[model samples]
Target chain A: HHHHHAMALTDRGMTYDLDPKDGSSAATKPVLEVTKKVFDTAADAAGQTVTVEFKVSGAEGKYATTGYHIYWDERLEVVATKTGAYAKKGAALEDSSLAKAENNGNGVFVASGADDDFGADGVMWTVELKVPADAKAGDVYPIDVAYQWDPSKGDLFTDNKDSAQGKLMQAYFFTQGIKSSSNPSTDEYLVKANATYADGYIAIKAGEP
Target chain B: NTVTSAVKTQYVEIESVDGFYFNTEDKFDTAQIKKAVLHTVYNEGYTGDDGVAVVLREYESEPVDITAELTFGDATPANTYKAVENKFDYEIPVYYNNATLKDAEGNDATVTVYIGLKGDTDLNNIVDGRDATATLTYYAATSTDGKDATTVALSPSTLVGGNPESVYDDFSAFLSDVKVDAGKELTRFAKKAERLIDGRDASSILTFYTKSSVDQYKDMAANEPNKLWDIVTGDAEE
Candidate 1:
């Protein structure tokens, strides 16, 4: 079985992709991967704005929640007062408390969101940033994405099926969900998925078109 | 008789010194930086002292190509002489020749050279309205909620090892962990923000940016130096 988990570290949004599968083992596994694709919108010079999309998909659970830390080139200033500035949430995270994003620093963006298992699997938010006036041609800016997870401050989690226990254990898509003859939590158990990240890039071209 | 040989771990710390001008005629000129060494104030367990191979990037953590605007000087083979636009600060990663020099945290080292005029907090060469606004905003944040502004804004003269993550949480935590020398220097920036980032200094930077376009502003800056904020803000000589 395949469980695909993804979080897009884009300047435009918060994306967490989760794919959970059921098997005969004792632990239920959910796959987590940070999908960093090259931005098609390249800037030719400074003072240009680029929008990135953050999304999540393949959530096969009752409830899902995830946190994110986005880092980009320091020279790029975030357009805060624009129409879709910062992490403007989409319909998936309609509740203000369910979704949040902050400008931790000049180039750091921190965000988190939670919703019904399947509800969290869509374009959640977007961040708009403007290239500095001094940026020249052939300059490439990197966008690094990471899933925020801490035992004290739990970031990635999901409920065990539709159980009353709600969201308890950390979710991971490492192996197939294993059902055990003796254990009850084994039915839809939780495993911490090891996450790997790939950095997205915003390449500067020759001149304004 | 049995003899045993053990390898000793070596650690080298590289730090950037403020007040070093680059891409200017004189190394001492702060208004328009002249030719100067990409100098590091401290190093450990390394032989060469004059210069090292440094890569100018946007940040210490993330790598982005910015060589078109900035370049390293190849004046001599051993040491690389380079410069900045005097617009913003540049973070440089210091490199030593094949030496196992560990960073402050005992990992691969990451060092940055803050190449810009002081009071330019936004790192955007000009100390305009934004700098004053940000400083005042940060001052309010730190005063009311203890939010960390200096940790992310200021570049320390020397980086000390073994600073707990909590040290960056607030000023109280940072002072508890830092020594007298580093603490004094670090808080100097905080105090400077508190004292100079007021309405007077704010208006002063605005005047500088405004008059910077006027023809007489050049002579006013050079001849009547005390008339500008450089003297008022203590960024003139240094």
Candidate 2:
């Protein structure tokens, strides 16, 4: 049962690469990992609109970021509208490819198919997020924006008969490296070394998936 | 042992008469059922000086990742609700009780913390009334004064062992019910219709709670709204 959270915690900021069933009990290898995903790569503080721009590309293999699932502890909402414009790079965020933004009935908003080029410019994809006004200072929000993969077969996995989609990015560490259809894995704390550029932090949940 | 675990378990309940947000033209308007959290408030009575160091955390009975971060609606870390001196004590202090909980401006307050539901309260994207329990542990402060309040946990057997008087233990209810508006009265079988959702299949359940059903239930409830008359109403019948 792949939970909607990054499996390994005690091992966050770490990377991994081993057999899909290396006793880790992880169903799939997390090829699509979050890149120290920050909450506001842009600017501003509490009550202000915080813009978080991050990538949801395949760290190891390839796949399309169908949607982004973020968990708000009741303090965050998408704003006047449930969703805002997505500044997607590489391929176009086709209206047809992605599904409409939904509040998911839960206090979270999912932007479907917004991160389209996971299979192509997988890494080049930068998601644009606006933390609403309802948010206050000191509140913490956990975001899960990794891909749901399957290592049982080959390259990338989708429509994962596992979770309705896939695993959530929580925390983990790798020994050798992160395994991908191509590359492997790694660490963080530094937003690409731009720590000073942070208001609310955006870190990835590391796990073996 | 002094404070029995008799914590009243409260649930985030909405005015959802029968689980529907609003039994309007559409018996259960999924649209009317907007995204909202069902929450409640706690005043000084529940949070006073004797209210030991109230520690709120995830209950063992909760799901594995149920990290329900609770805080004052206007405040952050649970302790901020307390006065500066009482901040680190881990319990409400005399100052907290006597002092009015106010903002920069003066306002009567009790530093109430609300624990509603959202993130983990749903099966998925559907809000079907799920719950998460929180452990509200109250720590003991020796002599009722600011003296030795920290060592109790260390010498539990000696301190609060037999007396069981240091603090009270309770829990917070996490309700995720957001259907606040329960529509007006329906027909005679109104109640039955409201609860007619008897273990029906998913699709069947959806079909049973449509606008048509609501209309029928409405017409059935009240004899005839516009007596002597009864022309075809708009998209909403009855």
Candidate 3:
């Protein structure tokens, strides 16, 4: 059976960048970053459970082991048991282990899934995290997630058809987590998150709202 | 040569002739003789071919025999000649009584009148040539008496034997002596004389108060009747 899930990595629903090599966090670079991005819609409603989704694909599968993690700092608070499981995505998640641990950490939430999510191909993945109203406005918390597939081993898989077994994929992704839309990466992502995460997104408005 | 008889007889004859001599039998009138003597004594040079000479000489008449007792008019045997000491002083009554008359009366009527002589108030009865001293003295005395009277009054002393002829002669002599250039003293004398003579006194015999009787006085006063009248009328009496 194949399954799929979504998750997020954030610091108060704001996204930030992370150093993939060291698995460390960095200050938010606000270039092309939205300031004071509000997400008070039904998609990210107050106290309603929501989710962040991430995926990954690439060459270099040797050093890539893909997973999701929640952290206050470098200490891992929540580790995904399955790469594509559907869990409550907002600060209201009832799973106490994930909720409590995710709430306690002042660090980022990062996302990385296995290469089995793509069919014999290697591409990029997205990591996302849930943001809550309880989250502060500007926070840069560090998180790292990895995806590695050995060439010698078979292709990996998640529980979804689009992430079936694939060729060898290895990549690393991290976030200086920002749960708030005020985060720099989230601002970039919102520009073109539907197209490609690296291609980023941007939003523009006319007056003070 | 002629023979004449020597027969003598006591006879008187009166004859008239165109011309006569002493030898003719012309009887002389004794009355005429005495009259001639008297003329030679008292009236000599008194008659001339003219009317009358204004002068007369002094003389004595026959002595009256007082023992024979003579009387004339209201006969009374009295002294015929009064001695100077016994001559009864008589005043000519001031018929025209006035201030001048009163003064003349008071002056004792020293203006003398005499027969055949001028009435001269200022005359002196002294011998003509007896050292003229007596004459001057007599003149001074009579002159003093004349002016002493405020007016003149005719008295017996003013007459020669109390005769009018003597008064006329005396008045003529006074007029002659006083008739000069009318000097102040003579003028005053004439004025007083005119006042008395004109009978203008306050109680004159003629005027006696009537204004016309004082006419001669008025004429005499001529330019100064008021002063003359004041003297004549006793206006200055007080």
Best by DockQ: 2
lDDT of 1 by residue, B99-207 (tens): 3235445675433322333334333333332333333333334445554444333211122121222221222222111112232344422332233233333334433
List candidate 1 stretches off by more than 4 Å.
A1-43, A60-62, A81-85, A95-97, A107-115, A148-151, A160-197, A205-209, B1-238
TM-score-superior candidate, 1 or 2: 1
**In lDDT terms, which candidate is top?**
1
Quote the true-contact fraction of every model: 0.00, 0.00, 0.00
Residue A44 shift from truth in candidate 3, angstroms: 6.4
Model 1, position B81, has a per-residue lDDT of: 27
Q: Go through the candidates in order and give each one's DockQ.
A: 0.01, 0.02, 0.00
Q: Provide the lowest-lDDT 10-residue window in model 3 chain B.
A: B31-40
The 10 consecutive residues of candidate 2 chain B with the worst lDDT sum are: B129-138
Tell me how large the interface RMSD of candidate 2 is: 18.8
The lDDT of each candidate is 0.35, 0.24, 0.23
- Predictions ranked by TM-score, top down? 1, 2, 3
What is the Å distance of residue A117 in model 3 from its true position?
Answer: 12
Better of 1 and 3 by TM-score: 1
What tens-digit string does per-residue lDDT give for candidate 3 at A38-60?
Answer: 34342343333222322222223
lDDT of candidate 1 over A1-209, digit per residue (tens): 88533222233222222222222232333333222323333434457777755554444443333344555556667776444335566544453133345445543333332222433445555567676777655455555454332211213334312222322223232221111111112111011111122234455543454
Give lDDT tens digits, candidate 2, residues A51-167. Answer: 343333332222223333322223333343423423233332332133223233222222322122233323333333345454433333433332121121111122211122232
